[PDB]
Amino acid sequence: APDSVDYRKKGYVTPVKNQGQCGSCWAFSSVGALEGQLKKKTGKLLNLSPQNLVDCVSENDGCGGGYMTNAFQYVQKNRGIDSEDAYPYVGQEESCMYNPTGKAAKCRGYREIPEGNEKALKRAVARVGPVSVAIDASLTSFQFYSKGVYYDESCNSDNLNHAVLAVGYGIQKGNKHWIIKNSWGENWGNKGYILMARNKNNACGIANLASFPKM
Numbered sequence: 761a762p763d764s765v766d767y768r769k770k771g772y773v774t775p776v777k778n779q780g781q782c783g784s785c786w787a788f789s790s791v792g793a794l795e796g797q798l799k800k801k802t803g804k805l806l807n808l809s810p811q812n813l814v815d816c817v818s819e820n821d822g823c824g825g826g827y828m829t830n831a832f833q834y835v836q837k838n839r840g841i842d843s844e845d846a847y848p849y850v851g852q853e854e855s856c857m858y859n860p861t862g863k864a865a866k867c868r869g870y871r872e873i874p875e876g877n878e879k880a881l882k883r884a885v886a887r888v889g890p891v892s893v894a895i896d897a898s899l900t901s902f903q904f905y906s907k908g909v910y911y912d913e914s915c916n917s918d919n920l921n922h923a924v925l926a927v928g929y930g931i932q933k934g935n936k937h938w939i940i941k942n943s944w945g946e947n948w949g950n951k952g953y954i955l956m957a958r959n960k961n962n963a964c965g966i967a968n969l970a971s972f973p974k975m
């Protein structure tokens with residue numbers, strides 16, 4: 761696998777979104793993974809609909825949280841997902857109104873990364889594209905990240921509370937990292953992004969609930 765990889769440089773990565781006061785990180789994370797595979801396979805980068813997942817993935821809890829695997833399964837089962845254009849984001853939950861004629865991607869299901877395996881997650885990013893990951897984002901050190909390879913030994917790998925997207929990995933001044941796209945807008949972290957420690961014993965549970973769509 762390559763030593764660094766950034767899928768923004770390949771245009772696999774839509775602009776940073778803002779989920780608002782709604783706990784739909786999992787739906788942003790899911791559409792991020794799907795956006796990546798769509799670009800990979802069509803050359804088309806378009807915004808897909810988290811609202812479609814927030815509204816229609818009954819297995820998930822809408823604005824109260826959800827799993828990305830359940831997102832990828834809904835899209836498979838449903839036989840498509842809408843563009844952001846076709847099913848725009850409200851930032852609050854609503855009735856499922858899946859527009860079939862606005863379907864902008866499909867899914868043959870998903871693969872999970874073996875729990876805790878950062879090397880496997882790295883290969884998944886190298887091989888497939890952007891990967892849906894979950895982390896503990898409850899520390900103040902996280903919430904007020906500016907710059908660097910983020911690392912806090914207070915981070916609990918067993919307390920996952922937030923879904924994000926590893927859009928690549930590399931190493932800056934010898935510190936190995938994950939390039940993580942957040943869904944709290946561009947005014948959080950580093951232009952809506954954080955670099956999180958890589959190969960520092962599964963820091964913040966970065967590899968505990970990692971998954972990618974089959975496309």
Ligand SMILES: *C(=N)N(CC(=O)N(C)Cc1ccccc1)NC(=O)OC(C)(C)C
Pocket residue numbers: 779782783784785786823824825826827828894895920921922923
């Ligand atoms: C993302 N927005 N999200 C939901 C969330 O943060 N809420 C509303 C609290 C919550 C966290 C964990 C479990 C239940 C509720 N996070 C989210 O979906 O977290 C994972 C770990 C992906 C379930």
